[PDB]
Every structure is written in C-alpha cells, then in structure tokens.
C-alpha cells in the first residue's frame, strides 16, 4: 500500500509499505502482539472498535463505514449530513440501532 | 420571560422564514383592507404591496423569537437587517 507521508522537501511523497490484510477478526489479541504498531489498526466491524477502543473510536469508525459505501457507489455526499447521522446513533452512549427497536424503545411521546 | 434589549443575543438578520411569514401575514392584512403606510405606484396585487412595505421597513410588526428554554425575544422588523 502506498502511503502519503511528508517529505523534508515540503510536499508529500508516496512511500509503499507492506500492510497485512486479514480474514477473520480478533482485535484485542492482535493489538497486544509485539512487532506491530499498537497505535494503528483498523477493523471493518465497528462494533469491536467500540468495545475495545471506546465510544469516540466507535463514532469515527462508524463514520468511516458509512462514508465507505458512499464513495464505493461513486457518489458525493456533504460532510454535514453524514456527521449528523453518525452523531444521532451515538448520543445515548454506545451504538444505537436504526430499527423499530432503536427509537421506539426510548421516550419521545407516545404518538411519535 | 422577555429578554431585555441589552441581552438580545440572537442573529440581527431577518431569515427567509421570518421574511416569508412577515410578507404573508402583511399581505393577508393588506388583502383585508389594512392601512397602507407607503404610497402605491399603481399596484393591485397585495403581495407586491407587502414587499413594497418591506423594502422601506414600514411594516408595523415585531417578531417574538422563541428560545429553546421557554424564553423569547422581541426583534422588530424595522430594526431587523433584511438581506
């Protein structure tokens, strides 16, 4: 994978590096192993990021997951809308489902 | 509970919703034989007369902006900077 890193000449330079793609998931164990950066690691399952790295990491990871499908479709959506959506799913702590069990199980008025 | 004039911390600019409802209510009053404060240039449509009064700030109204805590402010449409 090419990585844009700043050169001491004032502009970024693509510097390829070997990166390990992985099938299956186990974040906690992999993080503790010596020989890798414990400060860098990603998971396609945002749930594990929430559990291990906490609520803020769960938020950012959720935003990345949503943004990914958008960019994959070949479409552009403004930052505002996605940010609002992500925030709503995280304002009660943890991850909140968008379901009929995800906002009809919390008070908003009986009619709503 | 009516915030005083020295503590009004809302936007002094008139929004599109405030201009819309001011032109709609003012035009509705003009359609119902309201005293016009501006000399007409030959207009017949009430909305054009309402916009003519808004262009010179002769509309005698004041907006009660509701705050989320239950309070409100009184920003007269004459002191509101349009556009």
């Amino acid at each position: 994978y090419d990585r844009k890193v700043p050169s001491p000449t004032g502009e970024y330079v693509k510097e390829p590096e070997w990166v390990l793609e992985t099938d299956g998931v186990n974040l906690s164990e992999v993080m503790t192993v010596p020989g890798i950066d414990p400060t860098r690691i990603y998971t396609n399952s945002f749930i594990d990021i929430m559990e291990v790295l906490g609520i803020e990491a769960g938020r950012a990871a959720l935003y990345k997951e949503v943004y990914n499908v958008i960019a994959s479709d070949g479409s552009y959506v403004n930052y505002r809308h996605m940010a609002l959506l992500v925030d709503v799913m995280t304002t009660q702590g943890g991850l909140t489902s968008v379901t009929r069990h995800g906002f009809n199980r919390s008070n908003t008025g009986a009619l709503m | 509970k009516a915030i005083p004039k020295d503590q009004r911390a809302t936007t002094p600019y008139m929004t599109k919703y405030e201009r819309a409802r001011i032109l709609g209510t003012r035009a509705l009053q003009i359609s119902m034989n309201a005293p016009v404060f501006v000399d007409l240039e030959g207009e017949t449509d009430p909305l054009r007369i309402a916009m003519k009064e808004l262009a010179e700030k002769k509309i005698p109204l004041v907006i009660r902006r509701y705050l989320p805590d239950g309070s409100f402010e009184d920003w007269s449409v004459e002191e509101l900077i349009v556009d």
Binding site: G10, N78, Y79, R80, L84, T91 | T11, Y13, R65, P68
Partner: protein, 224 residues
C-alpha cells in the same frame, strides 16, 4: 427507516442542533454552522507548495536581501525598505502562517489541500481586478500595515455566534480557525502587492465582499 429515523431534528435560535425533547445531537450544525447551499471546493495555499516555495512566497524581507521586497511593486517601495516595524509585522504574519501550516499538517494527514469551504475568494479577486481596471505594470498605493492590519481587522468581523461569554467565543474561534487560516493564506502581502496589485478601494471592496459573503453563508436557524 431513514426518514422516520431523522425527523424531529432541527436547529433552534441558538445555532445548536437539538431534537424536540431538547437532546443536543450537535452543538453546531455541521460542526461549522454553514448551510449546504453556499459551500464550494477551495484550495489551501498554506500546505500546498514546497518549503522553498513557502519561504519564497510568505517572506517579504525589508532589512535582509534573502527575500527582499521589489520596490517597483508599490509606489512607496523606496520608503518601505529599511523599516523595522513592518518587518516585525511580517515576522508575526509569517510565524502565524507557519503555525497554520503545522496545524494543517496535524489536521489533514493525507496531503490534500482541496476541501469544501464557504466564500469563493478567487471570484472576488477577479471581480475586483475587472471592476477597478487593475492591470499589470501598475504600482499599488497599499502598504504592509494596510494589508496586515486589514486582515487582522477582518478576522474579528467574522461572527457566527452572537454571544460574548467564554465558551461561546471559544466555540467561535474553534469554528472559525480553518477559515481564518484560509484568509491568512490567500491574503498575504506578497500575493496582493506582487500578483494581484490591488489598490485601496479594491482591497477594501474585497474585504467587504468576503465579510458580506461570510455573513450570507451562515446557516439559518429553524431549518429541518
């Protein structure tokens, strides 16, 4: 599911996105307070370019011959050279641009300079040059204190929150930091005296247009 999921969410008359029950989702709509109908893709001139181009552009020396100022650019160029005060102001502006470059290095780690931001400065500059008949080989009547103090006085005029407390001004500065960095990047002494060759009425007109369009790019409270 999306429509019925996001419905009772709006922005009240305090520039804070909160639902009907009062639960605050975002303290500022879009984390900037700008509507999605006045944002245009802009380029950040602070991170773009090499170090030799950065120091070649943002250094206007008066007591040194490394990055000296060409006196033929402005009418009073023979009197600007040798001034210590304007050189100190250029030092403060240059240090501010360097701090903005480190900040942009920490914010955007991918290296991209194109990001959506309000207010198009290029169209204002072109409208000023085509309006005031600003052509090449024309000495300008501006100085260093007019551009530096003009930008510094324009940075205080940018207002999104109408408060006066500590947290309100902190959120205002943290919500205007990037745009102020863009204005400090596009509004340099070398970029105006060398390339643009703007005059007094043209520069003041550009300032009034930037402040005006910034006051029109604010999101309106009450929009769903």
């Amino acid at each position: 599911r999306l429509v019925k999921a996001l419905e009772d969410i709006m922005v009240h008359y305090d520039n804070t996105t909160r639902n009907s029950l009062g639960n605050v989702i975002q303290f500022i709509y879009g984390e900037d307070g700008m509507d999605a109908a006045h944002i245009e893709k802009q380029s950040l001139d602070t991170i773009g370019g090499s170090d030799a181009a950065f120091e070649k552009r943002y250094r206007v020396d008066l007591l040194n011959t490394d990055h000296t100022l060409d006196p033929s650019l402005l009418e009073s160029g023979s009197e600007i050279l040798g001034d210590l005060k304007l050189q100190v102001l250029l030092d403060e502006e240059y240090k501010q641009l360097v701090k903005d470059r480190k900040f942009l290095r920490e914010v955007f780690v991918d290296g991209e300079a194109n990001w959506p931001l309000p207010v198009n400065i290029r169209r204002i500059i072109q409208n000023a040059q085509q309006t005031f008949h600003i052509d090449h080989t024309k000495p300008s009547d501006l100085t260093i204190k007019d551009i530096v103090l003009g930008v510094k006085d324009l940075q205080e005029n940018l207002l999104v929150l109408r408060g006066k407390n500590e947290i309100i001004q902190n959120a205002q500065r943290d919500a205007v930091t990037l745009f102020c960095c863009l204005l400090r990047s596009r509004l340099a002494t070398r970029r105006v005296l060398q390339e643009y060759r703007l005059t007094k009425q043209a520069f003041d007109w550009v300032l009034s247009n930037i402040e005006a369009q910034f006051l029109r790019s604010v999101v309106h409270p009450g929009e769903m």
